[PDB]
Amino acid sequence: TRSSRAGLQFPVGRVHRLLRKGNYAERVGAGAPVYLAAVLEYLTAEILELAGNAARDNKKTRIIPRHLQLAIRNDEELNKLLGKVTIAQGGVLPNIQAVLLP
Amino acid sequence: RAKAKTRSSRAGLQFPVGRVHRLLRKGNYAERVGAGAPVYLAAVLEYLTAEILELAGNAARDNKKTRIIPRHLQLAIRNDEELNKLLGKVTIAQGGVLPNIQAVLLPKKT
Amino acid sequence: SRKESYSVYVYKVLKQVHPDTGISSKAMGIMNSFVNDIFERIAGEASRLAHYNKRSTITSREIQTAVRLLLPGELAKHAVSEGTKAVTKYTSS
Amino acid sequence: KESYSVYVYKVLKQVHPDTGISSKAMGIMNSFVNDIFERIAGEASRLAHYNKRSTITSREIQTAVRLLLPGELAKHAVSEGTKAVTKYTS
Amino acid sequence: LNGGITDMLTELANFEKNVSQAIHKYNAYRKAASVIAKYPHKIKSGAEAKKLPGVGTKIAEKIDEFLATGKLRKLEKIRQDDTSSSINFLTRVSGIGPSAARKFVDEGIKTLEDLRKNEDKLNHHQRIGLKYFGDFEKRIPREEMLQMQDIVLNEVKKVDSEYIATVCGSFRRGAESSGDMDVLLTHPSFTSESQPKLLHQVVEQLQKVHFITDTLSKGETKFMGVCQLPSKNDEKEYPHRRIDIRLIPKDQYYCGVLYFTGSDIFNKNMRAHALEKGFTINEYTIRPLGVTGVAGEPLPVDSEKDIFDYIQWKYREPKDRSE
Amino acid sequence: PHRYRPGTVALREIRRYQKSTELLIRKLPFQRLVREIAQDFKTDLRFQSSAVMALQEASEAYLVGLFEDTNLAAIHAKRVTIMPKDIQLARRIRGER
Amino acid sequence: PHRYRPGTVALREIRRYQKSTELLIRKLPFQRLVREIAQDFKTDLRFQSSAVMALQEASEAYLVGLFEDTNLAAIHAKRVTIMPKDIQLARRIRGE
Amino acid sequence: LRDNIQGITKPAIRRLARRGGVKRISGLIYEETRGVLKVFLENVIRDAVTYTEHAKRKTVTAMDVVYALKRQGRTLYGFG
Amino acid sequence: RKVLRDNIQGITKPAIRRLARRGGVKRISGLIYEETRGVLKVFLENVIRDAVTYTEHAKRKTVTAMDVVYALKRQGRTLYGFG
DNA sequence: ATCGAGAATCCCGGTGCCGAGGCCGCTCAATTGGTCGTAGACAGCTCTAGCACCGCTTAAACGCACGTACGCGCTGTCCCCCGCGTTTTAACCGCCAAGGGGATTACTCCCTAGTCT
DNA sequence: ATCGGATGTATATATCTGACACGTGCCTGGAGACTAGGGAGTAATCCCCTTGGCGGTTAAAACGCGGGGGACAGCGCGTACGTGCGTTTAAGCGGTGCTAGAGCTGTCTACGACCAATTGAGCGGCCTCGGCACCGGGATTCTCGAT
DNA sequence: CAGGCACGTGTCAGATATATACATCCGAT
């Protein structure tokens, strides 16, 4: 398949099918699904790296949505990319204002 | 071959149902477009434009002017309580702002 | 060129509502941009809402639903009434 | 029955072989990837429409990624995507 | 035994290829007809054909309907359909095919007479195919094809004694008849890493001795045309025959000869043997398969016996390459 | 007896509620509120359980963000105790009114 | 020696700049700033005048909104002078 | 169904505000937060019920709720 | 060719004062001018980046107003009027 | 709680000016019959998951009593920005060169679904 | 001092996965020469639209300085809001029992997608006269100093 | 049209939490 041909793990066939049926433009070029697959693979790899690094803390070998929210909020740029989205049962990162503390 | 009558006149509207149909076609929003969709959308645009210009015309009339300029339009849009909510994320070129001063900003008098 | 706009149209609407008022060119372009913005917004909402329900077309039902979604209370109510009267008059031919 | 479960699981195994992912976080990743793909595709579509070009190509998605993502993520993503497409070309 | 079933599968394959734009249904039907024609028993039911690998559900039901009734309702309906039958008949002309068949039938051209009356609507290849419609559909007796080999070899060595020309195919396999002429030519000065005219002199001198009379297409490496044996001037002239000449580099000539000698089942059997033994063989070269599957550089080939030696397989004569 | 300084157990409790990821709202009263606010728009409509859970999660996120922002405003006012003035100003400055 | 009380001339110009609708910023310094910010990214750019007008008055709108919210923040703190700490409040709680 | 608004209790608001990161709460916070929660909930429910009505079905779906949430900028993850 | 520099100071103090008066303030603290200039510079940079990327698309060396109003529409401004 | 003396701020015409709006010629895209193709409408069938009810259990909510600590309220200092002359200066205002690029138009190359081997 | 509470370790629940087998729609068909055409890239203008100087011209920015009002501390009550302890109340949980409608599948048929002719409505040039931008005087209104 | 097969879907030992008893440091008075 083309995913092996492009050295990628996200399905180029499925994303090409979505571009066909999502009705974004009348015809879609050849490299468009490949390039989307690469971009999505990079973003997912970054998210999972941050989540795994967070799960290394707290001695948790399994990814939890709390870990995912922590990893997203700790990063600077990923915080702004996902600013207006809420993760279900994700909670918030710990933060107490200095004036409140004695 | 009878005398052709435009579909906007058949529906009794002013905005063209034909142009809206064309824009829906080559706007790539759906594969197929029904017959009633453009006439409904044209009627909606008629109502919205009528509301805007009625308010702008009133704002020009009580400002002793007989021609709508962007100031009148922005005053009409921002003055209404719910028409503002439709257009609360938009800025109008050469629009200006409504005159409002908070109470504490006024002098204490006495 | 062959640039298109909503000049003839909005002028006719104004003369229908206010018989003794004119539009400055900047304000006229503002009205044009407003019309294009609302058209794009409504059509995009209708397109998305058609795509969810696995349907393959845009009709009066989902445009009515879209103008019930984006338009708030009074404005939405009157716009829906005007649109449905207009479409009934059209299909009556 | 659309899902991205096997692919994100493969990516996780490639990056962190020893770490498992729960079902709820799995669904969160599914929603996140769908969100990003929809956002990029919509941006590319409207960008193609403004320029009056009728087809989406690699360049238009490259530009859409450049707008949507912030700086260093944008440059990393465009480098990786260009590498992938030039690999697929040969 | 099973001639009717095979004939019906052939007709269905022809209709699928020419009328349906379905090359894979045509291939499946031809494969079923081939495997049925080799079955040494009179078929008693479609399920009997279904137990063995090959024939699927649809073909089994069609065979069962034939055994019950002696025909297929769909086949009978499509036989009397003027448009579909006209398309199928027009696709028999060399050069006139599916696209041309639909276009011609859509514009009223359904028979050979209409094709002759509409010469201006046919290209050179279609016109020549129309001219030799009867001749092309005839098979070539082995003696006439031996004579054509003799003429071709004398002309080739007349061009240059360093040329090497081989007549491949069912003839090289020793079959008593073939449907066309296949010649493979090479010159030591022409390798994969080395003239744009080497085909041209052979073609031109074959024109000069009036052996080949028509040109269907001609390039620097591939020529397809029409040739005819010289008449005695007192006996009936020989029918026109199809001839193809392929120019292949010397390092790929013997691989090409092995490919074009066949037979096809023998080709896949040898290819599977090479694959299961760690080699990949194509029409052009022979390459190794690594432990990770990566193909290597092509190995030097100087004979068919060489290719047989690399795959540790005893050299089999083309007479013994039936499968 | 041994009592705590006001704010101390408040800090312990703020830590224990900020680390964990519960729902913090009783499910049944929220579901009853959703059903009672939904019947105004359409009479006798059913509700999927996951829809109620999604509504609760969204309300939790919205309210917790609003409370963080209005606490920030209160601390800005040289003040530590939150009053409704703060909430309505946080709503107004964010464009919601 | 007739001097107005402080603050009164402030309110009456408030009336003036809320009643009129000009640009409130000189064209040439804004154009030079825009060209500088543009050449920071890439060189050899030319701008249409409508483009720099669009940037100018969009910037006016943004700064007007920011000062409106900053005034709200200042009045909240029982104070009539806006200091930068009010600006970081407005920027932070607006979500940017 | 009558005063479900009072269903959410004052300690529940207190715990939620604690998660928000606040130390002291006035007395009038509870009424204001009940009001703002009611207005936010009705704003979401209006769009969700509109989506449900367009689908010609008499039960809402969590998919409709996340769609109505995404419509007004509050994107939600973890439900599809 | 004439590399521009030091133009952020070109936005004069009276200009910020006038914008503040339009906003509705009574008095201005002395050190908000630098913060306002910084706030403005970051906003112009955010808009100009998108406009320049749009202009890089279609291989065009001039920045029109229509692409920059598209860039403004990207960031939730949706400018009317121009274009 | 007044008057009085000055600074802003609307009403009087005039003056003219440039653009809003009819008007005409042109042209190309709505409009009108006609064909096909298929997308939903509509029915009928599962079956599942959502509403209703009951009891058991217990953890959180509610009410009451105190303690005290932030919130306002009131003074007191001082300093920092505002109002108002003077003194530059850089933004306008045309007034042109000038040349670079953004649309148009004719010419030639990836691709492309087969067409056959 | 001094009396009590959030983290490290054992340690028996508990529990939610990941690899392992079926099922069933996707999915590529397998090797390549042509082959006659469609979008897309490329060269050649036209002019217009932006940029760069050029000198007057003055509105606006820069600056200085008195001083008055507000920002900021500081102190003082005091009542509103934390803790703490009964108690009681309704939430979770775990069953049952229906049954309304979510979702799926099979027919058709009535809408829409193309498609030639046709024309009339909308788009560019093109004037032309009037709504309105200035523009000084003349009354009006607003504001601050005395008393 | 025929195969090949990559996702989708049940199903169970076991890593992976998870709640429950002491010791220790901290924390406020």
Long-range (24+ apart) CB contacts under 8 A made by B7-12 are B7/B39, B7/C90, B8/B42, B10/C90, B10/C93, B11/B39, B11/B42, B11/B43, B11/C86, B11/C87, B11/C89, B11/C90, B12/C86, B12/C89
Q: Which of D58, D48, D66 is nearest to D82 (CA)?
A: D58
Which amino acid is it at E146?
Answer: L
Q: In what order do the strands lie in the sheet with E241-247?
A: E164-167, E181-186, E241-247, E222-227, E212-218
G82 near G67, Cβ under 8 Å? yes
I13 near G65, Cβ under 8 Å? no
Separation between Cα atoms, residue C13 and residue C19, nearest integer Å:
10
Instruction: Report how many domains make up chain C.
Output: 1
Helices D23-50, A31-56: axis angle to 10 degrees equals: 140
Separation between Cα atoms, residue E270 and residue E290, nearest integer Å:
19
* Site of tokens 């750019």: G45
Q: Which of F8, C61, F21 is nearest to A70 (CA)?
A: F21
* Site of tokens 């939730």: I76
Separation between Cα atoms, residue B94 and residue H25, nearest integer Å:
45
Element (H, E) at H77: strand H75-77
Residues of chain C contacting residue B30, judged by C-beta atoms under 8 Å apart: 46-47, 50-51, 56-58
Residues of chain H contacting residue A89, judged by C-beta atoms under 8 Å apart: 78
Residues 24-53 of B with CB under 8 A from A: 28-31
Whether residue F89 and residue G69 make contact (CB cut-off 8 A), yes or no, is no
Shortest CA to C1' contact from E29: nucleotide: L1
Separation between Cα atoms, residue C72 and residue F15, nearest integer Å:
41
I20 near I28, Cβ under 8 Å? yes
Task: Work out the angle at residue E154's Cα, subtended by the Cα atoms of residues E152 and E155, and round it to the nearest 5 degrees.
Answer: 65
SS percent in chain C: helix, strand, coil, step 5: 75, 5, 20
By the CB < 8 Å criterion, does B96 face chain G?
yes
Torsion angle of the four alpha carbons C23, C28, B52, B80, in this order, in degrees rounded to the nearest 10: -100
CB atoms within 10 A of CB B3: 4
Domain that holds residue C18: 1-93
Separation between Cα atoms, residue D33 and residue E293, nearest integer Å:
33
Residues 6 or more apart whose CB falls under 8 angstroms from that of H19 comprise A91, A92, F14, F17, F18, F24, F64, F67
Instruction: Report how many domains make up chain H.
Output: 1
Long-range (24+ apart) CB contacts under 8 A made by F40-49 are F40/H42, F41/H45, F41/H46, F41/H49, F42/H49, F42/H52, F42/H53, F44/H58, F45/H49, F45/H52, F45/H58, F45/H59, F45/H60, F46/H58, F46/H59, F46/H60, F47/H59, F47/H60, F48/H59, F48/H60, F48/H61, F48/H62
The partner residues of E218 in beta bridges, in order of sequence, read E223
SS (H, E, C) G57-86: HHHHHHHHHHHHHHHHHHHHCCCCEECHHH
Maximum CA pair distance of chain D?
49
Separation between Cα atoms, residue F54 and residue G61, nearest integer Å:
37
Q: Do E92 and E162 share a domain, yes or no?
A: no
Q: Do E284 and E248 share a domain, yes or no?
A: no
Whether the ω angle into residue C56 lies within 30 degrees of 0, i.e. cis, is no
DSSP I9-62: GGS-HHHHHHHHHHHT-SEE-TTHHHHHHHHHHHHHHHHHHHHHHHHHGGG-SE
The partner residues of H59 in beta bridges, in order of sequence, read F46
Separation between Cα atoms, residue G61 and residue I71, nearest integer Å:
16
Separation between Cα atoms, residue E305 and residue E255, nearest integer Å:
11
Record the tokens describing residue D85, joined without a space.
């497409």
Any idea what DSSP says for residue G7? T
Separation between Cα atoms, residue A67 and residue A50, nearest integer Å:
9
Record the tokens describing residue F5, joined without a space.
């300084």
Separation between Cα atoms, residue B59 and residue B39, nearest integer Å:
30
Q: Which of A20, A55, A47, A15 is nearest to A34 (CA)?
A: A15
CB atoms within 10 A of CB B70: 23
Q: Do E63 and E163 share a domain, yes or no?
A: no
* Site of tokens 């795509």: C51
Q: Which of E309, E183, F6, E243 is nearest to H23 (CA)?
A: F6
Domain that holds residue I20: 1-82
Separation between Cα atoms, residue E278 and residue D42, nearest integer Å:
48
Backbone angles phi, psi at A100, to 5 degrees: -65, -40
Strand, helix or coil for residue A28: strand
The partner residues of E183 in beta bridges, in order of sequence, read E167, E245
Strand, helix or coil for residue E216: strand
D6 exposure class (CB count in 10 Å sphere: 0-12, 13-18, 19+) = exposed
DSSP A64-97: -HHHHHHHHHHSSHHHHHTTTEEETT--------
Torsion angle of the four alpha carbons I46, I47, I53, I56, in this order, in degrees rounded to the nearest 10: -140
E145 near E181, Cβ under 8 Å? yes
Strand, helix or coil for residue B109: coil
B44 near C62, Cβ under 8 Å? no
Separation between Cα atoms, residue E5 and residue E20, nearest integer Å:
21
Helices G49-76, I13-23: axis angle to 10 degrees equals: 60
Residues of chain A contacting residue B31, judged by C-beta atoms under 8 Å apart: 23
Q: Which of C40, A44, E149, G82 is nearest to D5 (CA)?
A: A44
Separation between Cα atoms, residue E197 and residue E179, nearest integer Å:
28
Element (H, E) at E226: strand E222-227
CB atoms within 10 A of CB E272: 10
Q: Which of E170, C39, G90 is nearest to I39 (CA)?
A: G90
Residues 6 or more apart whose CB falls under 8 angstroms from that of B89 comprise I76, I77, I78
Task: Work out the angle at residue E79's Cα, subtended by the Cα atoms of residues E78 and E83, and round it to the nearest 5 degrees.
Answer: 70
Maximum CA pair distance of chain C?
49
Which residues of E belong to the annotated binding site for dTTP? Answer: 139, 170, 173, 179-180
Strand, helix or coil for residue B33: strand
G92 CB inside 7 Å of strand K: no
Give Cα B107 to chain centroid, integer Å.
39
Residues 42-81 of D with CB under 8 A from A: 42, 44-45, 48-49, 54-58, 60-62, 65, 68-73, 76-77, 80-81
Residue I58's alpha-carbon distances to D59, D63, I67, in angstroms, are 10, 11, 11
F77 near A99, Cβ under 8 Å? no
Separation between Cα atoms, residue A77 and residue D69, nearest integer Å:
9
**For position E73, which CATH number holds?**
1.10.150.110
Residues 3-42 of I with CB under 8 A from G: 3-5, 7-8, 10-12, 15, 18-29, 31-32, 35-36, 39-41
Separation between Cα atoms, residue E5 and residue B105, nearest integer Å:
101
Q: Which of H67, D28, H62 is nearest to F50 (CA)?
A: H62
Backbone angles phi, psi at E223, to 5 degrees: -130, 130
The partner residues of E224 in beta bridges, in order of sequence, read E217, E244
Maximum CA pair distance of chain B?
83
B54 exposure class (CB count in 10 Å sphere: 0-12, 13-18, 19+) = middle
The alpha-carbon radius of gyration of chain B (Å, integer) is 20
Residue I16's alpha-carbon distances to C11, E309, G79, G92, I12, in angstroms, are 39, 90, 20, 21, 7
Q: Which ranges of F1-97 would DSSP assign to H, the alpha helix?
A: 8-19, 27-38, 49-76, 84-93
G60 near G24, Cβ under 8 Å? yes
Q: Which of F12, F13, F17, F26 is the best residue to mutate to test the H interface, defined by the most H CB atoms within 10 Å of its own CB?
A: F17
Separation between Cα atoms, residue A16 and residue A32, nearest integer Å:
8
Q: Do chains I and A touch (3 or more CB pairs under 8 A)?
A: no
Instruction: Identify protein residues whose C-beta is within 7 angstroms of any atom in strand L.
Output: A 1, 3, 11, 60-62, 64, 102; D 1-3, 5-6, 18, 20; E 16, 24-25, 27-29, 31-32, 53-59; F 2-5, 8
E305 exposure class (CB count in 10 Å sphere: 0-12, 13-18, 19+) = exposed
Torsion angle of the four alpha carbons E11, E14, E20, E26, in this order, in degrees rounded to the nearest 10: 100
Separation between Cα atoms, residue H77 and residue C41, nearest integer Å:
24
Backbone angles phi, psi at D33, to 5 degrees: -65, -40
Torsion angle of the four alpha carbons E145, E146, E151, E153, in this order, in degrees rounded to the nearest 10: 110
By the CB < 8 Å criterion, does D35 face chain H?
yes
Separation between Cα atoms, residue F21 and residue F24, nearest integer Å:
9
Record the tokens describing residue C68, joined without a space.
């019930």
Separation between Cα atoms, residue C44 and residue E146, nearest integer Å:
74
Q: Which of B10, B62, B68, B61 is nearest to B36 (CA)?
A: B10
Task: Work out the angle at residue A43's Cα, subtended by the Cα atoms of residues A38 and A45, and round it to the nearest 5 degrees.
Answer: 90
Residue D49 C-alpha, separation from nearest chain B C-alpha, in angstroms: 8
Separation between Cα atoms, residue G43 and residue G46, nearest integer Å:
10
Record the tokens describing residue C60, joined without a space.
């009066």
Residues 6 or more apart whose CB falls under 8 angstroms from that of H46 comprise F41
Record the tokens describing residue I14, joined without a space.
């009276």
Q: Where are the domains of chain B?
A: 1-108
Residue H4's alpha-carbon distances to F30, F46, F93, H30, in angstroms, are 8, 18, 29, 14
Q: Which of B13, B70, B53 is nearest to B36 (CA)?
A: B13
Q: Which of E273, B105, D16 is nearest to G68 (CA)?
A: B105
Task: Work out the angle at residue A80's Cα, subtended by the Cα atoms of residues G84 and I44, and round it to the nearest 5 degrees.
Answer: 55
**For position I45, which CATH number holds?**
1.10.20.10
Could you tell me the resolution of this structure in angstroms? 3.3
Separation between Cα atoms, residue D69 and residue H76, nearest integer Å:
19
Q: Do E170 and E254 share a domain, yes or no?
A: yes
Record the tokens describing residue G28, joined without a space.
């040439």
- The end-to-end CA distance of chain I, in Å, is 31
Residues 6 or more apart whose CB falls under 8 angstroms from that of G79 comprise none
Which amino acid is it at H59?
Answer: T
* Site of tokens 């659309």: D2
Separation between Cα atoms, residue F36 and residue F43, nearest integer Å:
10
Buried/exposed A3-40: b ≥16 CB within 10 Å, e otherwise: beebebbbbbebbbebbeebbbbeebbebbbbbbbbbb
Separation between Cα atoms, residue E134 and residue E94, nearest integer Å:
11
Which residues of E belong to the annotated binding site? Answer: 50, 52, 55, 91, 93, 96, 139, 170, 173, 179-180, 182, 244
Q: How many helices (H) and strands (E) does chain C have?
A: 4, 2
Record the tokens describing residue C17, joined without a space.
């509502």
Record the tokens describing residue B54, joined without a space.
């009625």
Backbone angles phi, psi at F34, to 5 degrees: -65, -45
Which residues of E belong to the annotated binding site for dCTP? Answer: 139, 170, 173, 179-180
F45 near H59, Cβ under 8 Å? yes
Which method was used?
cryo-EM
Any idea what DSSP says for residue F46? B
Q: Do E254 and E145 share a domain, yes or no?
A: yes
Strand, helix or coil for residue B32: strand
Residue E215's alpha-carbon distances to E129, E178, E242, in angstroms, are 11, 20, 10
Backbone angles phi, psi at E316, to 5 degrees: -105, 130
SS (H, E, C) D16-68: CCCCEECHHHHHHHHHHHHHHHHHHHHHHHHHHHHCCCCEECHHHHHHHHHHH
Task: Work out the angle at residue C72's Cα, subtended by the Cα atoms of residues C68 and C75, and round it to the nearest 5 degrees.
Answer: 85
Record the tokens describing residue E241, joined without a space.
């025959």
